[PDB]
Curated annotation (Swiss-Prot):
Reactions mediated catalytically: Hydrolysis of proteins with specificity similar to that of pepsin A, prefers hydrophobic residues at P1 and P1', but does not cleave 14-Ala-|-Leu-15 in the B chain of insulin or Z-Glu-Tyr. Clots milk
Top-tier EC class: hydrolase
Lyase found in the keyword field: no
A GO BP entry: proteolysis
Protein name as annotated: Endothiapepsin
Alphabetically ordered keywords of this record: Aspartyl protease, Disulfide bond, Hydrolase, Protease, Signal, Zymogen
Active site: 35, 199
Lineage: Eukaryota, Fungi, Dikarya, Ascomycota, Pezizomycotina
EC number: 3.4.23.22
Family recorded in the similarity comment: Belongs to the peptidase A1 family.
Gene that this polypeptide is encoded by: EAPA
Residues of the full protein shown: 90 to 419 of 419
């Protein structure tokens, strides 16, 4: 089997991407944030505290003839941005782009933190990291990809995120028309539950490539590119007037600037992030200070190849017995 679904930016900045997902019988379609940095499929629901729902579409398990309470199971998750959610668990039929999994754990939110409430465009998350990170207790549950893998034509999914435009998540096949050149594959460590890999270095604009190992995670659920402070300083030093602002919470730059590109290495290959992809717009409405899309990871504990980086590539998440990651230009 295969599946193919379009993923759409939630706003004009590409702050996140939503993909429609069918849950239950008859189908209830929710727009979920596919997140290769976590491993829970959770949704706003009829069980979510009413004051914490503000415009989201909810899953109502009582209206699904295939929903079953997973007795005794609870979940609770906290994300790197400080947001969180928790609740109980149903199993139900879940389909993405024509690919169907029966018996998928659908984690129903009883509580969500304010940032989820305040984002009316995201109805939940669909985790695509390794199932060892799944938070369901006392019986850990598998991701949608883990459940589908055996049925897929090939045990892979691909992320093709657009810049200011829709893109595609495919399951079970590699669309050879969706990228240019060849796909360069690189090793993955699953020891932390992430799609963790080592970039071979970077360049800023037309500058020379610096060969240096940068361990980080391919995370579709993180908006920006978080890299070591040395790398980030070298980037922003090429932008007149750019500075790190403690009050804003990262590097800002004059909105009048033209930003240089940023290149990262994948083995001997190179992925070029155009400068425009690094512009996240005014820090507050009407400001002439703009927020940068490359930020320091120094306070995180891990480097994160988020959407800013991944949207410059066609990315293969290869879930073979030994997982690997593939990157191609597009």
């Amino acid at each position: 089997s295969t599946g193919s679904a379009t993923t759409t930016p939630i706003d004009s900045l590409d702050d996140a991407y939503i993909t429609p997902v069918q849950i239950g019988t008859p189908a209830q379609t929710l727009n979920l944030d596919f997140d290769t940095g976590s491993s829970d499929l959770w949704v706003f629901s009829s069980e979510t505290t009413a004051s914490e729902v503000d415009g989201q579409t909810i899953y109502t398990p009582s209206k699904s003839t295939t929903a079953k309470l997973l007795s005794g199971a609870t979940w609770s998750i906290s994300y790197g941005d400080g947001s969180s959610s928790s609740g109980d668990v149903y199993t139900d039929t879940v389909s993405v782009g024509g690919l169907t999994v029966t018996g998928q754990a659908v984690e129903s939110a009883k509580k969500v933190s304010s940032s989820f409430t305040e984002d009316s465009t995201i109805d939940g998350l669909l985790g695509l990291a390794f199932s060892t990170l799944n938070t369901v207790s006392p019986t850990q549950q598998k991701t949608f990809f883990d459940n589908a893998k055996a049925s897929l034509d090939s045990p892979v999914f691909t992320a093709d995120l657009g810049y200011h435009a829709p893109g595609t998540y495919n399951f079970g096949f590699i669309d050879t028309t969706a990228y240019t050149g060849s796909i360069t594959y690189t090793a993955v460590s699953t020891k932390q539950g992430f799609w963790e890999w080592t970039s071979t270095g970077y360049a800023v604009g037309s500058g020379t490539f610096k060969s240096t190992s940068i361990d980080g995670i391919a995370d579709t659920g993180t908006t920006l590119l978080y890299l070591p402070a040395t790398v980030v300083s070298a980037y922003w030093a090429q932008v007149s007037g750019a500075k790190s602002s403690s009050s804003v919470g990262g590097y800002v730059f004059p909105c009048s600037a033209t930003l240089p590109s940023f290149t990262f290495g994948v083995g001997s290959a190179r992925i070029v992030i155009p400068g425009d992809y690094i512009d996240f717009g005014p820090i507050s409405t009407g400001s002439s200070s703009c927020f940068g899309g490359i930020q320091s990871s120094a306070g995180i504990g891990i480097n994160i190849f988020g959407d800013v980086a991944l949207k410059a590539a066609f990315v293969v998440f290869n879930g073979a017995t030994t997982p690997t990651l593939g990157f191609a230009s597009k």
